[PDB]
Structures are given as structure tokens and as C-alpha cells.
Amino acid sequence: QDLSEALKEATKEVHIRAENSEFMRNFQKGQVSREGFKLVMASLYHIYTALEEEIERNKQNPVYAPLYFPEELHRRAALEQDMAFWYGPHWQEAIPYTPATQHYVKRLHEVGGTHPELLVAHAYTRYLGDLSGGQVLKKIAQKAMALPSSGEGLAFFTFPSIDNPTKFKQLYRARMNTLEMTPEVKHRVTEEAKTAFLLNIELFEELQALLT
């Protein structure tokens, strides 16, 4: 089986659980305020910082390199804008760094440092969602919180260097299928993607509790 297909099949169940998390149910209904939203975007700041640092460490590694798309995909600069929007000029000292975020970041460094053949599972889990349900979350955020169409506060959800998310996702999928793939690597990559989803589910369960 192609890796792109293996990953979708492996994560289709946990994806259902993730999109139906209590935090996300509240989001999709429109119940999340500025406070909740600042919490999740600050958490994403740390996650994508760790993820993109590990992507840089491994950019020339053949186990990842075909998926190296900083210009199109990387979120850190965009999140730095959003942090300045939501938290102001001294956001680096203002933003929270929660335990679940720390746990997620810790795994990203373990993977990037010790198991870079699995890094694709983590880039997959975040980026392809950003290019999918991410786009729906963006419209909900705009409506709920009165965020302007011009895009301030929602740079994270904006991909100026991609014309069509759907087309780019097809490209990224075909490119995943180009990675050197053994039964050993494909088994562990699909397992690591399931873990990536759980780390996200646990972040969202934590934030929901912090707010209630």
C-alpha cells in the first residue's frame, strides 16, 4: 500500500475522535473566546517551532527531504505574527507553555533527534490538517471572534505561497509515496501518526479543562 493511503487508513478512526473532541465541538459551534483561542495558538507556536526546527535539522536527510517545503508550509513566522496580534509586542514573555504542549514538543525532539524516519508522521499530522479542517476552523474563528478578512490574527491558517490547498495536498501525498519505504518504516510511521493525533487530542483535552 502507498504511504499516503496507509497513513489515511491508519488515522481515520483517531481523526474522528479528534474532530469530535469537546474543545473542537465548542470551537465548531462557536463557543470559544479570545482567551481559549490565544491558548491554542500559543500552544501551536511551541509545537510548530519544535517541528520546524527538527525539519531543518533533517532537511538533507533522504527519510524526510522530499517533504521539505519551508516556503509553502512552514508556520512559525505566521505564528509569530499571530502572537504579536493576540499578545502584543512582548508576547515571548507573555505566552503560556502548557504541560501537554511540553509533552508534544518533547516527542517532536525525540523523533527529530533519534527517529527522523518518523518525522513525516508529524509533518503529515499537522500540515495536511492545516490544509484541510484548518481552513474550516479559520472561517469559524473569523465569524465567532470578528476577525477581518484581511487576515490579521489568523496568519497561521493562511498559506500565501500555495494557490490551491487541495492540489498541494495531492502533490504532498504523491511526494510521501516517494520516500524509501520498507515494511518496518511504514508500520512505525503509521503508528507515530496515531501518536501525533493523540498528542493533539491531549493538548485539546488539557486546554478545555484550563478554560472550564
PDB file of N, CA, C and O in Angstrom, residues 50-120:
ATOM      1  N   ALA A  50       9.144  23.618  17.415  1.00  0.00           N
ATOM      2  CA  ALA A  50       9.873  22.378  17.608  1.00  0.00           C
ATOM      3  C   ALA A  50       9.864  21.540  16.324  1.00  0.00           C
ATOM      4  O   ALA A  50      10.892  20.992  15.937  1.00  0.00           O
ATOM      5  N   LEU A  51       8.705  21.450  15.675  1.00  0.00           N
ATOM      6  CA  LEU A  51       8.572  20.635  14.472  1.00  0.00           C
ATOM      7  C   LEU A  51       9.467  21.177  13.357  1.00  0.00           C
ATOM      8  O   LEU A  51      10.130  20.416  12.653  1.00  0.00           O
ATOM      9  N   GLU A  52       9.468  22.498  13.191  1.00  0.00           N
ATOM     10  CA  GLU A  52      10.194  23.105  12.072  1.00  0.00           C
ATOM     11  C   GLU A  52      11.707  23.176  12.306  1.00  0.00           C
ATOM     12  O   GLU A  52      12.483  23.105  11.362  1.00  0.00           O
ATOM     13  N   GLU A  53      12.107  23.232  13.573  1.00  0.00           N
ATOM     14  CA  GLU A  53      13.495  23.082  13.978  1.00  0.00           C
ATOM     15  C   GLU A  53      14.014  21.685  13.627  1.00  0.00           C
ATOM     16  O   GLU A  53      15.112  21.537  13.080  1.00  0.00           O
ATOM     17  N   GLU A  54      13.219  20.658  13.925  1.00  0.00           N
ATOM     18  CA  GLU A  54      13.593  19.291  13.573  1.00  0.00           C
ATOM     19  C   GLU A  54      13.570  19.041  12.072  1.00  0.00           C
ATOM     20  O   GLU A  54      14.357  18.247  11.566  1.00  0.00           O
ATOM     21  N   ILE A  55      12.667  19.699  11.361  1.00  0.00           N
ATOM     22  CA  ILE A  55      12.644  19.623   9.907  1.00  0.00           C
ATOM     23  C   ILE A  55      13.954  20.201   9.318  1.00  0.00           C
ATOM     24  O   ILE A  55      14.541  19.604   8.406  1.00  0.00           O
ATOM     25  N   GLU A  56      14.412  21.328   9.873  1.00  0.00           N
ATOM     26  CA  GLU A  56      15.684  21.948   9.467  1.00  0.00           C
ATOM     27  C   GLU A  56      16.886  21.056   9.745  1.00  0.00           C
ATOM     28  O   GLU A  56      17.744  20.888   8.879  1.00  0.00           O
ATOM     29  N   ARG A  57      16.925  20.468  10.944  1.00  0.00           N
ATOM     30  CA  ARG A  57      17.987  19.528  11.325  1.00  0.00           C
ATOM     31  C   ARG A  57      18.068  18.369  10.316  1.00  0.00           C
ATOM     32  O   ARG A  57      19.168  17.928   9.953  1.00  0.00           O
ATOM     33  N   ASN A  58      16.916  17.924   9.822  1.00  0.00           N
ATOM     34  CA  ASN A  58      16.832  16.767   8.925  1.00  0.00           C
ATOM     35  C   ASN A  58      16.508  17.050   7.446  1.00  0.00           C
ATOM     36  O   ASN A  58      16.174  16.123   6.695  1.00  0.00           O
ATOM     37  N   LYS A  59      16.615  18.310   7.020  1.00  0.00           N
ATOM     38  CA  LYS A  59      16.231  18.701   5.645  1.00  0.00           C
ATOM     39  C   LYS A  59      16.974  17.938   4.537  1.00  0.00           C
ATOM     40  O   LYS A  59      16.382  17.619   3.508  1.00  0.00           O
ATOM     41  N   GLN A  60      18.250  17.622   4.779  1.00  0.00           N
ATOM     42  CA  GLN A  60      19.110  16.928   3.814  1.00  0.00           C
ATOM     43  C   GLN A  60      19.045  15.412   3.987  1.00  0.00           C
ATOM     44  O   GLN A  60      19.693  14.677   3.244  1.00  0.00           O
ATOM     45  N   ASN A  61      18.290  14.945   4.978  1.00  0.00           N
ATOM     46  CA  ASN A  61      18.124  13.512   5.192  1.00  0.00           C
ATOM     47  C   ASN A  61      17.072  12.948   4.230  1.00  0.00           C
ATOM     48  O   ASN A  61      15.932  13.407   4.220  1.00  0.00           O
ATOM     49  N   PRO A  62      17.444  11.926   3.438  1.00  0.00           N
ATOM     50  CA  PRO A  62      16.534  11.274   2.487  1.00  0.00           C
ATOM     51  C   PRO A  62      15.233  10.707   3.082  1.00  0.00           C
ATOM     52  O   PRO A  62      14.273  10.515   2.341  1.00  0.00           O
ATOM     53  N   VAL A  63      15.205  10.416   4.387  1.00  0.00           N
ATOM     54  CA  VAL A  63      13.976   9.927   5.048  1.00  0.00           C
ATOM     55  C   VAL A  63      12.902  11.016   5.174  1.00  0.00           C
ATOM     56  O   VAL A  63      11.741  10.717   5.456  1.00  0.00           O
ATOM     57  N   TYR A  64      13.298  12.276   4.959  1.00  0.00           N
ATOM     58  CA  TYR A  64      12.382  13.403   5.053  1.00  0.00           C
ATOM     59  C   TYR A  64      12.387  14.337   3.832  1.00  0.00           C
ATOM     60  O   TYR A  64      11.334  14.882   3.427  1.00  0.00           O
ATOM     61  N   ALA A  65      13.589  14.529   3.279  1.00  0.00           N
ATOM     62  CA  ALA A  65      13.906  15.602   2.318  1.00  0.00           C
ATOM     63  C   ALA A  65      12.908  15.882   1.176  1.00  0.00           C
ATOM     64  O   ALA A  65      12.707  17.053   0.828  1.00  0.00           O
ATOM     65  N   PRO A  66      12.307  14.832   0.565  1.00  0.00           N
ATOM     66  CA  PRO A  66      11.230  15.091  -0.404  1.00  0.00           C
ATOM     67  C   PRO A  66      10.033  15.897   0.133  1.00  0.00           C
ATOM     68  O   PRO A  66       9.295  16.488  -0.662  1.00  0.00           O
ATOM     69  N   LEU A  67       9.845  15.930   1.453  1.00  0.00           N
ATOM     70  CA  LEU A  67       8.742  16.702   2.051  1.00  0.00           C
ATOM     71  C   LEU A  67       9.159  18.077   2.566  1.00  0.00           C
ATOM     72  O   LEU A  67       8.377  18.768   3.213  1.00  0.00           O
ATOM     73  N   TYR A  68      10.376  18.487   2.236  1.00  0.00           N
ATOM     74  CA  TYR A  68      10.916  19.764   2.697  1.00  0.00           C
ATOM     75  C   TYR A  68      10.349  20.940   1.887  1.00  0.00           C
ATOM     76  O   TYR A  68      10.805  21.220   0.765  1.00  0.00           O
ATOM     77  N   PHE A  69       9.345  21.614   2.462  1.00  0.00           N
ATOM     78  CA  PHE A  69       8.652  22.714   1.810  1.00  0.00           C
ATOM     79  C   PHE A  69       8.548  23.933   2.725  1.00  0.00           C
ATOM     80  O   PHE A  69       7.446  24.338   3.074  1.00  0.00           O
ATOM     81  N   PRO A  70       9.680  24.550   3.110  1.00  0.00           N
ATOM     82  CA  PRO A  70       9.528  25.680   4.046  1.00  0.00           C
ATOM     83  C   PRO A  70       8.653  26.814   3.539  1.00  0.00           C
ATOM     84  O   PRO A  70       7.858  27.355   4.317  1.00  0.00           O
ATOM     85  N   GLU A  71       8.788  27.174   2.259  1.00  0.00           N
ATOM     86  CA  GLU A  71       8.136  28.383   1.742  1.00  0.00           C
ATOM     87  C   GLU A  71       6.632  28.198   1.722  1.00  0.00           C
ATOM     88  O   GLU A  71       5.913  29.079   2.152  1.00  0.00           O
ATOM     89  N   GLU A  72       6.174  27.059   1.207  1.00  0.00           N
ATOM     90  CA  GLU A  72       4.750  26.717   1.156  1.00  0.00           C
ATOM     91  C   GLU A  72       4.088  26.438   2.521  1.00  0.00           C
ATOM     92  O   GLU A  72       2.947  26.861   2.760  1.00  0.00           O
ATOM     93  N   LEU A  73       4.773  25.709   3.398  1.00  0.00           N
ATOM     94  CA  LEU A  73       4.092  25.081   4.532  1.00  0.00           C
ATOM     95  C   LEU A  73       4.459  25.619   5.897  1.00  0.00           C
ATOM     96  O   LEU A  73       3.603  25.680   6.761  1.00  0.00           O
ATOM     97  N   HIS A  74       5.724  25.976   6.109  1.00  0.00           N
ATOM     98  CA  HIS A  74       6.165  26.309   7.458  1.00  0.00           C
ATOM     99  C   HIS A  74       5.292  27.394   8.113  1.00  0.00           C
ATOM    100  O   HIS A  74       4.882  28.352   7.451  1.00  0.00           O
ATOM    101  N   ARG A  75       4.993  27.213   9.402  1.00  0.00           N
ATOM    102  CA  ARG A  75       4.041  28.064  10.117  1.00  0.00           C
ATOM    103  C   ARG A  75       4.648  29.001  11.137  1.00  0.00           C
ATOM    104  O   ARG A  75       3.962  29.874  11.615  1.00  0.00           O
ATOM    105  N   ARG A  76       5.916  28.816  11.491  1.00  0.00           N
ATOM    106  CA  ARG A  76       6.493  29.573  12.606  1.00  0.00           C
ATOM    107  C   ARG A  76       6.445  31.100  12.459  1.00  0.00           C
ATOM    108  O   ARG A  76       6.048  31.779  13.407  1.00  0.00           O
ATOM    109  N   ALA A  77       6.847  31.637  11.303  1.00  0.00           N
ATOM    110  CA  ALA A  77       6.798  33.099  11.081  1.00  0.00           C
ATOM    111  C   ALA A  77       5.366  33.604  11.197  1.00  0.00           C
ATOM    112  O   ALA A  77       5.128  34.624  11.825  1.00  0.00           O
ATOM    113  N   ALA A  78       4.429  32.881  10.582  1.00  0.00           N
ATOM    114  CA  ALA A  78       2.989  33.178  10.656  1.00  0.00           C
ATOM    115  C   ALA A  78       2.463  33.207  12.103  1.00  0.00           C
ATOM    116  O   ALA A  78       1.714  34.129  12.481  1.00  0.00           O
ATOM    117  N   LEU A  79       2.884  32.223  12.903  1.00  0.00           N
ATOM    118  CA  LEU A  79       2.539  32.160  14.325  1.00  0.00           C
ATOM    119  C   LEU A  79       3.182  33.300  15.127  1.00  0.00           C
ATOM    120  O   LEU A  79       2.605  33.781  16.099  1.00  0.00           O
ATOM    121  N   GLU A  80       4.363  33.746  14.705  1.00  0.00           N
ATOM    122  CA  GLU A  80       4.992  34.903  15.344  1.00  0.00           C
ATOM    123  C   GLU A  80       4.189  36.186  15.114  1.00  0.00           C
ATOM    124  O   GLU A  80       4.044  37.000  16.033  1.00  0.00           O
ATOM    125  N   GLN A  81       3.644  36.350  13.914  1.00  0.00           N
ATOM    126  CA  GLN A  81       2.681  37.433  13.654  1.00  0.00           C
ATOM    127  C   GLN A  81       1.449  37.328  14.574  1.00  0.00           C
ATOM    128  O   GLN A  81       1.058  38.313  15.210  1.00  0.00           O
ATOM    129  N   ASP A  82       0.853  36.132  14.653  1.00  0.00           N
ATOM    130  CA  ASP A  82      -0.379  35.932  15.412  1.00  0.00           C
ATOM    131  C   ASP A  82      -0.123  36.178  16.894  1.00  0.00           C
ATOM    132  O   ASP A  82      -0.959  36.762  17.581  1.00  0.00           O
ATOM    133  N   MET A  83       1.047  35.763  17.376  1.00  0.00           N
ATOM    134  CA  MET A  83       1.414  36.003  18.766  1.00  0.00           C
ATOM    135  C   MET A  83       1.514  37.511  19.080  1.00  0.00           C
ATOM    136  O   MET A  83       1.058  37.952  20.126  1.00  0.00           O
ATOM    137  N   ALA A  84       2.085  38.282  18.162  1.00  0.00           N
ATOM    138  CA  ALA A  84       2.170  39.742  18.294  1.00  0.00           C
ATOM    139  C   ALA A  84       0.789  40.403  18.244  1.00  0.00           C
ATOM    140  O   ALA A  84       0.558  41.386  18.937  1.00  0.00           O
ATOM    141  N   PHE A  85      -0.115  39.851  17.431  1.00  0.00           N
ATOM    142  CA  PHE A  85      -1.516  40.287  17.345  1.00  0.00           C
ATOM    143  C   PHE A  85      -2.302  40.032  18.642  1.00  0.00           C
ATOM    144  O   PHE A  85      -2.988  40.927  19.150  1.00  0.00           O
ATOM    145  N   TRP A  86      -2.218  38.807  19.156  1.00  0.00           N
ATOM    146  CA  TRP A  86      -3.034  38.385  20.282  1.00  0.00           C
ATOM    147  C   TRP A  86      -2.430  38.798  21.616  1.00  0.00           C
ATOM    148  O   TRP A  86      -3.161  39.159  22.539  1.00  0.00           O
ATOM    149  N   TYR A  87      -1.106  38.765  21.707  1.00  0.00           N
ATOM    150  CA  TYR A  87      -0.414  39.012  22.964  1.00  0.00           C
ATOM    151  C   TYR A  87       0.390  40.320  22.985  1.00  0.00           C
ATOM    152  O   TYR A  87       0.946  40.678  24.013  1.00  0.00           O
ATOM    153  N   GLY A  88       0.473  41.016  21.859  1.00  0.00           N
ATOM    154  CA  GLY A  88       1.192  42.295  21.800  1.00  0.00           C
ATOM    155  C   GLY A  88       2.700  42.197  21.577  1.00  0.00           C
ATOM    156  O   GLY A  88       3.224  41.115  21.309  1.00  0.00           O
ATOM    157  N   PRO A  89       3.415  43.330  21.707  1.00  0.00           N
ATOM    158  CA  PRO A  89       4.843  43.407  21.365  1.00  0.00           C
ATOM    159  C   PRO A  89       5.765  42.549  22.246  1.00  0.00           C
ATOM    160  O   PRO A  89       6.818  42.113  21.767  1.00  0.00           O
ATOM    161  N   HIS A  90       5.378  42.303  23.504  1.00  0.00           N
ATOM    162  CA  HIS A  90       6.177  41.446  24.397  1.00  0.00           C
ATOM    163  C   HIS A  90       5.558  40.048  24.630  1.00  0.00           C
ATOM    164  O   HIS A  90       5.449  39.570  25.767  1.00  0.00           O
ATOM    165  N   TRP A  91       5.174  39.401  23.529  1.00  0.00           N
ATOM    166  CA  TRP A  91       4.482  38.112  23.552  1.00  0.00           C
ATOM    167  C   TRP A  91       5.370  36.944  23.984  1.00  0.00           C
ATOM    168  O   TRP A  91       4.890  36.005  24.603  1.00  0.00           O
ATOM    169  N   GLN A  92       6.657  37.016  23.658  1.00  0.00           N
ATOM    170  CA  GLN A  92       7.640  35.985  24.023  1.00  0.00           C
ATOM    171  C   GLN A  92       7.706  35.757  25.537  1.00  0.00           C
ATOM    172  O   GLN A  92       7.994  34.658  26.004  1.00  0.00           O
ATOM    173  N   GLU A  93       7.430  36.800  26.302  1.00  0.00           N
ATOM    174  CA  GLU A  93       7.392  36.676  27.747  1.00  0.00           C
ATOM    175  C   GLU A  93       5.974  36.412  28.266  1.00  0.00           C
ATOM    176  O   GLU A  93       5.795  35.919  29.385  1.00  0.00           O
ATOM    177  N   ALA A  94       4.976  36.723  27.439  1.00  0.00           N
ATOM    178  CA  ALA A  94       3.565  36.603  27.807  1.00  0.00           C
ATOM    179  C   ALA A  94       2.967  35.205  27.585  1.00  0.00           C
ATOM    180  O   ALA A  94       2.177  34.733  28.410  1.00  0.00           O
ATOM    181  N   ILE A  95       3.333  34.546  26.488  1.00  0.00           N
ATOM    182  CA  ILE A  95       2.644  33.305  26.069  1.00  0.00           C
ATOM    183  C   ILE A  95       2.843  32.087  27.001  1.00  0.00           C
ATOM    184  O   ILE A  95       3.941  31.854  27.499  1.00  0.00           O
ATOM    185  N   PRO A  96       1.772  31.314  27.236  1.00  0.00           N
ATOM    186  CA  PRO A  96       1.890  30.121  28.071  1.00  0.00           C
ATOM    187  C   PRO A  96       2.589  28.952  27.372  1.00  0.00           C
ATOM    188  O   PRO A  96       2.640  28.887  26.137  1.00  0.00           O
ATOM    189  N   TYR A  97       3.098  28.028  28.180  1.00  0.00           N
ATOM    190  CA  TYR A  97       3.767  26.834  27.693  1.00  0.00           C
ATOM    191  C   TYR A  97       3.270  25.686  28.552  1.00  0.00           C
ATOM    192  O   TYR A  97       3.881  25.363  29.564  1.00  0.00           O
ATOM    193  N   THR A  98       2.156  25.084  28.149  1.00  0.00           N
ATOM    194  CA  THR A  98       1.462  24.096  28.966  1.00  0.00           C
ATOM    195  C   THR A  98       2.152  22.720  28.970  1.00  0.00           C
ATOM    196  O   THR A  98       2.930  22.418  28.062  1.00  0.00           O
ATOM    197  N   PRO A  99       1.903  21.899  30.016  1.00  0.00           N
ATOM    198  CA  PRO A  99       2.425  20.522  30.084  1.00  0.00           C
ATOM    199  C   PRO A  99       2.154  19.636  28.849  1.00  0.00           C
ATOM    200  O   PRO A  99       3.088  19.008  28.343  1.00  0.00           O
ATOM    201  N   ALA A 100       0.912  19.592  28.369  1.00  0.00           N
ATOM    202  CA  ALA A 100       0.571  18.858  27.139  1.00  0.00           C
ATOM    203  C   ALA A 100       1.346  19.373  25.900  1.00  0.00           C
ATOM    204  O   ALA A 100       1.732  18.591  25.033  1.00  0.00           O
ATOM    205  N   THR A 101       1.578  20.682  25.844  1.00  0.00           N
ATOM    206  CA  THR A 101       2.396  21.284  24.796  1.00  0.00           C
ATOM    207  C   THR A 101       3.836  20.805  24.932  1.00  0.00           C
ATOM    208  O   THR A 101       4.452  20.411  23.941  1.00  0.00           O
ATOM    209  N   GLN A 102       4.344  20.834  26.168  1.00  0.00           N
ATOM    210  CA  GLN A 102       5.685  20.347  26.525  1.00  0.00           C
ATOM    211  C   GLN A 102       5.885  18.888  26.147  1.00  0.00           C
ATOM    212  O   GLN A 102       6.918  18.545  25.591  1.00  0.00           O
ATOM    213  N   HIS A 103       4.897  18.051  26.460  1.00  0.00           N
ATOM    214  CA  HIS A 103       4.873  16.628  26.101  1.00  0.00           C
ATOM    215  C   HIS A 103       4.964  16.428  24.572  1.00  0.00           C
ATOM    216  O   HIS A 103       5.777  15.645  24.098  1.00  0.00           O
ATOM    217  N   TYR A 104       4.158  17.176  23.817  1.00  0.00           N
ATOM    218  CA  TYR A 104       4.151  17.163  22.354  1.00  0.00           C
ATOM    219  C   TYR A 104       5.510  17.573  21.763  1.00  0.00           C
ATOM    220  O   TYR A 104       6.062  16.860  20.915  1.00  0.00           O
ATOM    221  N   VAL A 105       6.026  18.718  22.219  1.00  0.00           N
ATOM    222  CA  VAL A 105       7.339  19.261  21.859  1.00  0.00           C
ATOM    223  C   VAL A 105       8.475  18.262  22.162  1.00  0.00           C
ATOM    224  O   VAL A 105       9.402  18.085  21.367  1.00  0.00           O
ATOM    225  N   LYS A 106       8.359  17.586  23.304  1.00  0.00           N
ATOM    226  CA  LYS A 106       9.345  16.622  23.758  1.00  0.00           C
ATOM    227  C   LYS A 106       9.410  15.443  22.776  1.00  0.00           C
ATOM    228  O   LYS A 106      10.496  15.038  22.339  1.00  0.00           O
ATOM    229  N   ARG A 107       8.247  14.913  22.411  1.00  0.00           N
ATOM    230  CA  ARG A 107       8.216  13.885  21.400  1.00  0.00           C
ATOM    231  C   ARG A 107       8.755  14.333  20.029  1.00  0.00           C
ATOM    232  O   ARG A 107       9.449  13.567  19.372  1.00  0.00           O
ATOM    233  N   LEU A 108       8.449  15.561  19.614  1.00  0.00           N
ATOM    234  CA  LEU A 108       8.974  16.111  18.334  1.00  0.00           C
ATOM    235  C   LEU A 108      10.503  16.147  18.264  1.00  0.00           C
ATOM    236  O   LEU A 108      11.108  15.828  17.226  1.00  0.00           O
ATOM    237  N   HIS A 109      11.117  16.521  19.383  1.00  0.00           N
ATOM    238  CA  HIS A 109      12.562  16.473  19.529  1.00  0.00           C
ATOM    239  C   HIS A 109      13.142  15.077  19.585  1.00  0.00           C
ATOM    240  O   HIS A 109      14.200  14.849  19.005  1.00  0.00           O
ATOM    241  N   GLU A 110      12.459  14.148  20.263  1.00  0.00           N
ATOM    242  CA  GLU A 110      12.892  12.749  20.258  1.00  0.00           C
ATOM    243  C   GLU A 110      12.872  12.204  18.839  1.00  0.00           C
ATOM    244  O   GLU A 110      13.827  11.584  18.394  1.00  0.00           O
ATOM    245  N   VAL A 111      11.770  12.432  18.130  1.00  0.00           N
ATOM    246  CA  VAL A 111      11.649  11.968  16.760  1.00  0.00           C
ATOM    247  C   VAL A 111      12.725  12.609  15.859  1.00  0.00           C
ATOM    248  O   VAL A 111      13.470  11.900  15.194  1.00  0.00           O
ATOM    249  N   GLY A 112      12.813  13.939  15.871  1.00  0.00           N
ATOM    250  CA  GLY A 112      13.780  14.643  15.050  1.00  0.00           C
ATOM    251  C   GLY A 112      15.218  14.320  15.404  1.00  0.00           C
ATOM    252  O   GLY A 112      16.077  14.289  14.535  1.00  0.00           O
ATOM    253  N   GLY A 113      15.473  14.076  16.687  1.00  0.00           N
ATOM    254  CA  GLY A 113      16.814  13.802  17.174  1.00  0.00           C
ATOM    255  C   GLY A 113      17.216  12.345  17.023  1.00  0.00           C
ATOM    256  O   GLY A 113      18.355  12.056  16.689  1.00  0.00           O
ATOM    257  N   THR A 114      16.279  11.424  17.252  1.00  0.00           N
ATOM    258  CA  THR A 114      16.613   9.997  17.353  1.00  0.00           C
ATOM    259  C   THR A 114      15.937   9.122  16.305  1.00  0.00           C
ATOM    260  O   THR A 114      16.494   8.101  15.924  1.00  0.00           O
ATOM    261  N   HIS A 115      14.745   9.503  15.841  1.00  0.00           N
ATOM    262  CA  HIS A 115      13.988   8.675  14.868  1.00  0.00           C
ATOM    263  C   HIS A 115      13.470   9.520  13.709  1.00  0.00           C
ATOM    264  O   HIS A 115      12.254   9.591  13.526  1.00  0.00           O
ATOM    265  N   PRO A 116      14.376  10.206  12.953  1.00  0.00           N
ATOM    266  CA  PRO A 116      13.930  11.128  11.864  1.00  0.00           C
ATOM    267  C   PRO A 116      13.138  10.477  10.733  1.00  0.00           C
ATOM    268  O   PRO A 116      12.440  11.171   9.991  1.00  0.00           O
ATOM    269  N   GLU A 117      13.266   9.163  10.583  1.00  0.00           N
ATOM    270  CA  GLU A 117      12.442   8.423   9.636  1.00  0.00           C
ATOM    271  C   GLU A 117      10.930   8.512   9.972  1.00  0.00           C
ATOM    272  O   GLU A 117      10.078   8.224   9.125  1.00  0.00           O
ATOM    273  N   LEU A 118      10.613   8.923  11.205  1.00  0.00           N
ATOM    274  CA  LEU A 118       9.209   9.063  11.635  1.00  0.00           C
ATOM    275  C   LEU A 118       8.722  10.508  11.559  1.00  0.00           C
ATOM    276  O   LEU A 118       7.540  10.783  11.761  1.00  0.00           O
ATOM    277  N   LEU A 119       9.628  11.435  11.292  1.00  0.00           N
ATOM    278  CA  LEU A 119       9.261  12.847  11.303  1.00  0.00           C
ATOM    279  C   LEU A 119       8.083  13.138  10.365  1.00  0.00           C
ATOM    280  O   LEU A 119       7.235  13.983  10.664  1.00  0.00           O
ATOM    281  N   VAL A 120       8.032  12.410   9.248  1.00  0.00           N
ATOM    282  CA  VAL A 120       6.970  12.536   8.257  1.00  0.00           C
ATOM    283  C   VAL A 120       5.572  12.363   8.847  1.00  0.00           C
ATOM    284  O   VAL A 120       4.647  13.082   8.463  1.00  0.00           O
TER     285      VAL A 120
END
